[PDB]
Amino acid sequence: RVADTIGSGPVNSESIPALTAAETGHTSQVVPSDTMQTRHVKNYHSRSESTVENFLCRSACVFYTTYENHDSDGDNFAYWVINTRQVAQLRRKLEMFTYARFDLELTFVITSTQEQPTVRGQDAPVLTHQIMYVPPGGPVPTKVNSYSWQTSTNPSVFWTEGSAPPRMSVPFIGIGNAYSMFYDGWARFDKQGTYGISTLNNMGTLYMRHVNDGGPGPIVSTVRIYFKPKHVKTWVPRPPRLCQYQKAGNVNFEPTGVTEGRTDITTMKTT
Amino acid sequence: RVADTIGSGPVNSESIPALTAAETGHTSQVVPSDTMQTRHVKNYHSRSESTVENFLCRSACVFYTTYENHDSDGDNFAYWVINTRQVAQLRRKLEMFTYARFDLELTFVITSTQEQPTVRGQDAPVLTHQIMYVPPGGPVPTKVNSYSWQTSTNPSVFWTEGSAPPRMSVPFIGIGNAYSMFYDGWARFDKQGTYGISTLNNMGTLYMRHVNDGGPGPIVSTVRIYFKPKHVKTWVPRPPRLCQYQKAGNVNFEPTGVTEGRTDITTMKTT
Amino acid sequence: RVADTIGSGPVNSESIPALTAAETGHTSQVVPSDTMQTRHVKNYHSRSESTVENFLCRSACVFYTTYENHDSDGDNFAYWVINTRQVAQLRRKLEMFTYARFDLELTFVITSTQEQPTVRGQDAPVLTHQIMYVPPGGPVPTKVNSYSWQTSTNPSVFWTEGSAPPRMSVPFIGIGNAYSMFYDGWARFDKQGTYGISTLNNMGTLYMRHVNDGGPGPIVSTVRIYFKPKHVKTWVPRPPRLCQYQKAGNVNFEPTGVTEGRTDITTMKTT
Amino acid sequence: SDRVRSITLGNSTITTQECANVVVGYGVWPTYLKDEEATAEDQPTQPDVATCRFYTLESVMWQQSSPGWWWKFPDALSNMGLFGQNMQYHYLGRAGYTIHVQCNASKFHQGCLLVVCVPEAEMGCATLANKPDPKSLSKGEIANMFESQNSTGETAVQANVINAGMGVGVGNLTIFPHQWINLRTNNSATIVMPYINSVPMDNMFRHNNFTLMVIPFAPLSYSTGATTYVPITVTVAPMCAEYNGLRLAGKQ
Amino acid sequence: GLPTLSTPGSNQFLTSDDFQSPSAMPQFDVTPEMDIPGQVNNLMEIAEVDSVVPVNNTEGKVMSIEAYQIPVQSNPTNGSQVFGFPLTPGANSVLNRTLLGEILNYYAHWSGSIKLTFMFCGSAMATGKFLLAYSPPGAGAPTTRKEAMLGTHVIWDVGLQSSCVLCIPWISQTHYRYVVMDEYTAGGYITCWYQTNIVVPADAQSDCKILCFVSACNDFSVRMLKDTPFIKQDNFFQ
Amino acid sequence: GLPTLSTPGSNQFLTSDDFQSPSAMPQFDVTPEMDIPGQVNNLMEIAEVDSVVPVNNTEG
Amino acid sequence: GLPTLSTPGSNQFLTSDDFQSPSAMPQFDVTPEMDIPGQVNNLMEIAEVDSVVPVNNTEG
Amino acid sequence: GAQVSTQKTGAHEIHYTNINYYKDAASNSANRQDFTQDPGKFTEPVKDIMVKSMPALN
Amino acid sequence: GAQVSTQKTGAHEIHYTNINYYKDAASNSANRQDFTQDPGKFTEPVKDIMVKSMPALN
Amino acid sequence: GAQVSTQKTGAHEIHYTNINYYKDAASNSANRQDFTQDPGKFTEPVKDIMVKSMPALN
Ligand SMILES: CCCCCCCCCCCCC/C=C/[C@@H](O)[C@H](N)CO
Ligand SMILES: CCCCCCCCCCCCC/C=C/[C@@H](O)[C@H](N)CO
Ligand SMILES: CCCCCCCCCCCCC/C=C/[C@@H](O)[C@H](N)CO
């Protein structure tokens, strides 16, 4: 909830609220009552929707990729090394903070489409997909039927088409006390090698495939991945990203103007 | 939960923590504080995830096989004699212990595919499968429509495509006080005959088939079987399997090196 | 739960437990302790699974029949006069008792298949079936669209394909105080006419059909019927059926040997 | 004092001049079967002093090339006096054992043995499609030997030491009850093994239970002049042996 | 019917899910528990047990009991290095195959102190002092005893107590290191050097072996289950 | 609606399942129990009864 | 089974929904919180901070 | 009116909860927990008892 | 262990009920009701307070 | 007969609720909360204790 504006009247003092020294690096706590005659207003406005949690807590696509029912070996299955920097939207939000701690709610939207070399009497049974998460170090699949798909330990989801977006919750899996959105440092003590946020990035890889083996007609499926931070804690706010993004692994940017321009410091015409 | 490291300082005693006699077959209970100056650390790390239950309690494919809608008599239906040794992953985990006792959660992922001699106007109604468990001794099916599929006593599951992995729980059905993962003995008192773990193996057979009889176009369905130990108790831990597996019914192996090698006992270059 | 074996020692008495007179038609209540030196054993074995209820309480197919989407008038719909004697399995179990009283849980597995005169652009909407129970005396259907299918009073189930086995519970609907599995008598006082268990059999008829009327391509559906006795009470146990069954309406049998044979009364070789 | 030791079982006593402690099973000490754990109903025989005593097996010589040896229990004791006779007449039996491995050298000698008891040591065949034969598995009171190269044989046990005949790193045999005999400090190892099995009792001919393995991790070594004959003797005592199911004798 | 609304997640089969499920065998009477020696409850009970480390895992020695034997002998020089390997228990060949390494391989993160025990297998007449050390990362690996000595070290003196313990403290900037090998998560170097020399009388071997064991200390824990890269398969065994 | 989430197992038909199910004949009044001699509760009551063993089961 | 009736909304995936969901990593032990200076709870804490306004935003 | 019973647990080392939702007793689940047992009907229907340690025919 | 909270209702003119069904806190719904607020960290990090009606630079 | 336990929460800064619906203990969920731990069986099976600060071989 917000502040009531308390009624105030005439003044003729030597207390000067309006005059300060911004050099101190301190934001003035002035309110209308200090510089004009105010009436009393009982303010009921709440700041419920600007809470960091409500700000970040909405599912956002972080990526998508495709794989095919049949066609052999790249095509057959797909994989994605988890990271939140390949999309503009979410990435800019998380990036309004330097460090953050949160749980995640993953939701997957999986859709399928038919490809042109059609075939007659094509009548395919429903499709079931499998998504497997391979923590750093785990044996990774090499083709749609590698032994690793038996997932005796890696977690996986098997989902059938037409049945509602599979979903899971994942804890704060970070190894530090928070996820770092920025890292002005290197991976190696000699500073040779990578520099920047990518040095920290090691959250594993997702692997997806069709379970029912390839039928006559070719089918392509796309897996859209959604992230939803939950139970959010965020520290050290920073300016929102100005320059558009260029690369997923660093902050590289093309210089850009501070704002749009207008004709003179006197123009009321809103752009 | 783990131990706090208690702060320690200088020493000049005749108590020698660092010196022991490993000949005793006893592992030293030393901690940092015994050999260096330690600061106090309140450790909050928990060992929740290394509990035997959380280690084994994740569904793992133990096998899969196929059968066809139409095509006659081998093809028509499938069967599997239950055992956990035909897969590398799970088998190696259970095998980190000599004896174990646990319940099981079976989950089946069943998928179907169309085969090439297609036919026109192929528009097949949804498929329903039946899986039947035949305890040792029960009359076993001989073709897709044998009387035994009436299951008046054997348990069976009927499941329709597109509706979520059928699942059941099965108790510790062993006849001993635990399942033995190893058995250095024979089935016969005269030692003629089989030797090894297979002498104990008698858990029955699974039988699967399509229920709707064969339509025009050929269809092949694969049944993937998942095992998930629950309510686990495990005794006599053993070294993890080094040599790869060769056979499902015994421990036969090809000798193999203890580790990968490196150039000298002085090389810091991690392989 | 079972009996503990109580420890016993040497004896030299004139009490003779081992010697009896089976002529009395009385089974000896001897236990190991009476004829040998026993150690004490606390027995935890339970007889939970041999309770009459757990023995009979598992769904069993009692019949199945078929009908077609299109094709006219026999084919169009099917019917079955309810009885439990057309299957070997269940029938032999119920028959281990002379009289029984129980409720029933009916489950139906309905599957459909395409027939050969296929047609192009065959794309059939999902199928809905109707099963109607016609108590003795009720007007019975004569074709797929007879007035009787309006079921203002007979109970019926309408079920759509792909949605999980329809199921109902039916009380002990018998008119006597129990269902008789045997009846050594006649239906008529003059003994002319039928003799045997069939004289009692009058439980009505089931009628099934497709609801959506016949489309271009022919489709055949099979209805498998499952019976599961519940809340079971059983009297006068009898010997299990030796000879195979020949007829559904009587006990007619082909004489058969008491057991398999072996070479001599001295052969330990299990057959 | 306390490196010295004396153990009396039956009419036999063992003494040691330089031991470590005595490693005890998995902390469990052997004991007869409890009525709550029992299933066979007949009254057991518990001979005692006549069967639970120290039996000394054949000695073996440690040479600078020996890869190791192994013996299987109860097998190794199937011919030792009354313990063996009881095994023959009974369908079932169970027992624990105190195992005492002996090996004295000199101060100028060096070497170090791993002495382990591996419960349920199923072994692999040298040729993948076969099963080893009874004798490749156990030669009774006569030690079988590991080899320092892949064994070949059409029915032999794949005895290359590095995988201890089981397909595992020999260096991890350590999670099993063991001691070391580092000649520099020790001269014997004593291990008490409780009865470990997934059933209360078992037939003693068709199941082995545990295998004693003696494997040198640092080879016997010495300067010329020093005695080259360094035997390793194994003395074992059944503990709390009971049998059930008496009948005529033999295997079959 | 009770008005209900299905949520995303319905009907999926997640391998690490935890729900109840009907039993296919109602009223089945299990066989009474027994009481077998050696029950295990946490993989960490296993990782806390010493296993012999194959320090001498050079080329041809890797298929020999020799992989386990560290060579030590009398020398005409001072402060020679006996051995050296990095603190990368999950991924380095020296450590990754021990009981500790095998368990680490079923996980993605680890944390804790580790104990390395050295057992001298010379003869009773041999003597010698060694300097065992651990050096956190950042600077290189020590190439001389004067460099190693400036870090965490213990000076082992051979005598009645054949064995001696170098305990490696957990000094990381993180809390958890990956078992997987990352330069970010570098753990330092373990090395050993002669403090004096192996002095022996005439008629006693000057060449000796030293065995080295590993196990976790009481602050050790692993996190994040994953499958091991150590067991492959081409198709169902038969 | 009460937010719900379906689990594996939904819609299967396991022959040894044990659930409630609607009765097709609501309020049906069953016929009073009687009291017939020889009730049986456990198959073991039957197995505890002597039966004549065909020891002489040779050939003919 | 408990008689149930599904309502409109079932199975949809609304991006701003708020339901519970199974955790893919059961019993995962997170790393202890720390206490970093500068925690933020509401975007308004940021909007309440002075930023330099580019009033002279003409052309070049 | 929830009924709490005991699960089949095993012997050498817990409750459920059921609520009936239908108006008819026939709709109820199975009576899988009825362990009554009386062999005497078939094993000893003899009018004059018959003691074990005694001479069966006097 | 049902928890009853308050719904966002509005201001110039009611409760819910939640039961957690999973063993892991990460499975729980969002903390959409946490209204803590402290601008002072960023708006007034000055060591010597700074009163409004007063001469900022003395 | 609802059982309320504690969720895995984390350490430097809540309950669930479960009701079992099946007659068989095997139908129950996992025992993911059993944290018993005893290394002594394997780490110190020595009959004569072994103190740390003491001379291992007397
Ligand atoms: C069965 C599917 C399981 C799926 C498991 C996914 C786990 C990955 C969660 C990642 C949360 C990452 C958010 C990004 C953090 C990075 O910004 C920082 N560079 C790390 O400090
Ligand atoms: C309707 C489907 C019912 C399915 C019933 C499956 C029952 C089988 C459970 C088997 C658990 C076996 C795990 C393996 C144990 C073996 O390692 C040992 N050799 C036995 O001592
Ligand atoms: C909407 C579908 C309703 C289905 C109703 C089915 C009712 C029939 C129940 C029959 C139970 C019969 C078991 C057999 C009993 C016979 O053995 C005896 N001959 C009768 O005394």
Side-chain angles (χ1 to χ4, degrees), chain A residues 82-233:
Chain A
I82 311 154
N83 98 285
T84 56
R85 285 172 265 101
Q86 304 186 75
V87 276
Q89 293 190 331
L90 182 59
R91 173 167 177 191
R92 189 167 105 121
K93 295 211 290 174
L94 291 162
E95 297 193 349
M96 282 183 73
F97 310 106
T98 309
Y99 309 106
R101 188 170 167 126
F102 54 77
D103 295 332
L104 263 181
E105 185 202 60
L106 266 66
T107 322
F108 292 104
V109 174
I110 305 179
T111 38
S112 284
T113 300
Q114 251 192 308
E115 265 194 335
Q116 260 289 223
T118 50
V119 177
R120 286 57 174 258
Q122 236 232 253
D123 159 73
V126 64
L127 289 180
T128 301
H129 308 236
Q130 161 183 15
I131 302 179
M132 171 172 73
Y133 168 77
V134 187
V140 102
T142 33
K143 56 197 175 63
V144 281
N145 62 330
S146 306
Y147 72 107
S148 31
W149 294 103
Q150 55 176 278
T151 28
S152 69
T153 306
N154 300 349
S156 299
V157 215
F158 287 84
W159 172 90
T160 284
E161 288 199 21
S163 72
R167 168 178 275 169
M168 304 96 78
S169 293
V170 154
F172 164 71
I173 57 97
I175 61 172
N177 304 53
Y179 292 137
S180 236
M181 313 294 135
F182 296 90
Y183 176 66
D184 176 9
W186 297 274
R188 331 188 52 230
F189 309 91
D190 57 23
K191 312 181 205 253
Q192 296 307 83
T194 116
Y195 159 82
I197 200 45
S198 216
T199 120
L200 298 180
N201 183 225
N202 199 351
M203 325 288 147
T205 318
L206 248 44
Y207 274 81
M208 32 282 226
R209 77 174 173 159
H210 282 98
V211 162
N212 359 26
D213 29 52
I219 285 176
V220 183
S221 308
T222 305
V223 165
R224 264 162 239 256
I225 304 178
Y226 293 89
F227 274 13
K228 173 150 101 214
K230 280 194 301 191
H231 316 142
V232 176
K233 285 225 183 185

Side-chain angles (χ1 to χ4, degrees), chain B residues 22 50 56 129:
Chain B
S50 25
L56 300 180
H129 308 236

Side-chain angles (χ1 to χ4, degrees), chain A residues 15-17 20-21 24-27 29-31 34 44 47-48 51 53-54 57 103 169 171 230-231 237, chain I residues 8 11-12 25-32 34-35 37 42-46 50 52-57:
Chain A
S15 93
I16 5 84
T20 186
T24 64
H26 150 281
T27 306
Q29 297 305 297
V30 163
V31 282
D34 303 310
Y44 297 115
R47 297 182 160 171
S48 37
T51 68
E53 186 103 0
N54 291 306
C57 193
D103 295 332
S169 293
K230 280 194 301 191
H231 316 142
Chain I
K8 245 298 279 161
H12 223 15
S27 307
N28 300 337
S29 70
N31 301 339
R32 312 194 98 126
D34 183 302
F35 308 133
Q37 201 166 198
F42 333 104
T43 66
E44 299 182 277
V46 280
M50 293 223 82
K52 167 163 63 180
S53 53
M54 298 285 264
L57 287 186

Side-chain angles (χ1 to χ4, degrees), chain E residues 2 11 45 58 63 81-82 98 118 120 141 150 161 164 176:
Chain E
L2 160 76
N11 309 115
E45 283 162 293
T58 55
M63 290 214 37
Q81 179 165 6
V82 175
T98 47
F118 300 90
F120 186 83
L150 297 177
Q161 75 304 321
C164 165
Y176 283 105

Side-chain angles (χ1 to χ4, degrees), chain J residues 37-51:
Chain J
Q37 201 166 198
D38 187 26
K41 334 201 185 71
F42 333 104
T43 66
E44 299 182 277
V46 280
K47 178 186 164 301
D48 305 85
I49 5 288
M50 293 223 82
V51 214

Side-chain angles (χ1 to χ4, degrees), chain C residues 30-74:
Chain C
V30 163
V31 282
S33 354
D34 303 310
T35 69
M36 67 210 295
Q37 285 190 44
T38 271
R39 72 165 280 157
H40 177 250
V41 173
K42 289 166 203 163
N43 230 303
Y44 297 115
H45 301 172
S46 178
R47 297 182 160 171
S48 37
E49 234 179 341
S50 25
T51 68
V52 147
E53 186 103 0
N54 291 306
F55 173 60
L56 300 180
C57 193
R58 286 199 170 183
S59 279
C61 194
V62 291
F63 197 68
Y64 69 78
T65 185
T66 68
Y67 47 101
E68 306 200 35
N69 195 28
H70 222 328
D71 307 64
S72 334
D73 286 323

Side-chain angles (χ1 to χ4, degrees), chain C:
Chain C
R1 168 168 307 184
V2 307
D4 287 1
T5 124
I6 72 98
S8 30
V11 178
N12 207 317
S13 58
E14 281 190 286
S15 93
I16 5 84
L19 293 179
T20 186
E23 286 90 350
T24 64
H26 150 281
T27 306
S28 178
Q29 297 305 297
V30 163
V31 282
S33 354
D34 303 310
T35 69
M36 67 210 295
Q37 285 190 44
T38 271
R39 72 165 280 157
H40 177 250
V41 173
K42 289 166 203 163
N43 230 303
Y44 297 115
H45 301 172
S46 178
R47 297 182 160 171
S48 37
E49 234 179 341
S50 25
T51 68
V52 147
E53 186 103 0
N54 291 306
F55 173 60
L56 300 180
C57 193
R58 286 199 170 183
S59 279
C61 194
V62 291
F63 197 68
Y64 69 78
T65 185
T66 68
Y67 47 101
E68 306 200 35
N69 195 28
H70 222 328
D71 307 64
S72 334
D73 286 323
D75 312 273
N76 255 162
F77 70 82
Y79 71 66
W80 175 56
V81 348
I82 311 154
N83 98 285
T84 56
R85 285 172 265 101
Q86 304 186 75
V87 276
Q89 293 190 331
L90 182 59
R91 173 167 177 191
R92 189 167 105 121
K93 295 211 290 174
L94 291 162
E95 297 193 349
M96 282 183 73
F97 310 106
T98 309
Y99 309 106
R101 188 170 167 126
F102 54 77
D103 295 332
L104 263 181
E105 185 202 60
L106 266 66
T107 322
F108 292 104
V109 174
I110 305 179
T111 38
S112 284
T113 300
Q114 251 192 308
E115 265 194 335
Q116 260 289 223
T118 50
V119 177
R120 286 57 174 258
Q122 236 232 253
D123 159 73
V126 64
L127 289 180
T128 301
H129 308 236
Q130 161 183 15
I131 302 179
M132 171 172 73
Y133 168 77
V134 187
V140 102
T142 33
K143 56 197 175 63
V144 281
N145 62 330
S146 306
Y147 72 107
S148 31
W149 294 103
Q150 55 176 278
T151 28
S152 69
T153 306
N154 300 349
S156 299
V157 215
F158 287 84
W159 172 90
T160 284
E161 288 199 21
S163 72
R167 168 178 275 169
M168 304 96 78
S169 293
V170 154
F172 164 71
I173 57 97
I175 61 172
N177 304 53
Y179 292 137
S180 236
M181 313 294 135
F182 296 90
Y183 176 66
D184 176 9
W186 297 274
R188 331 188 52 230
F189 309 91
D190 57 23
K191 312 181 205 253
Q192 296 307 83
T194 116
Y195 159 82
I197 200 45
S198 216
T199 120
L200 298 180
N201 183 225
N202 199 351
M203 325 288 147
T205 318
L206 248 44
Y207 274 81
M208 32 282 226
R209 77 174 173 159
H210 282 98
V211 162
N212 359 26
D213 29 52
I219 285 176
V220 183
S221 308
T222 305
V223 165
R224 264 162 239 256
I225 304 178
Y226 293 89
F227 274 13
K228 173 150 101 214
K230 280 194 301 191
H231 316 142
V232 176
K233 285 225 183 185
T234 50
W235 299 266
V236 191
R238 27 178 63 226
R241 173 83 167 195
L242 210 210
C243 305
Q244 298 287 158
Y245 289 106
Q246 302 295 336
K247 303 297 187 190
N250 58 54
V251 305
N252 293 353
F253 62 97
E254 256 186 55
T256 137
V258 131
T259 3
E260 294 258 290
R262 56 186 178 141
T263 40
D264 28 52
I265 37 176
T266 252
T267 332
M268 293 298 159
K269 286 104 279 170
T270 144
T271 55

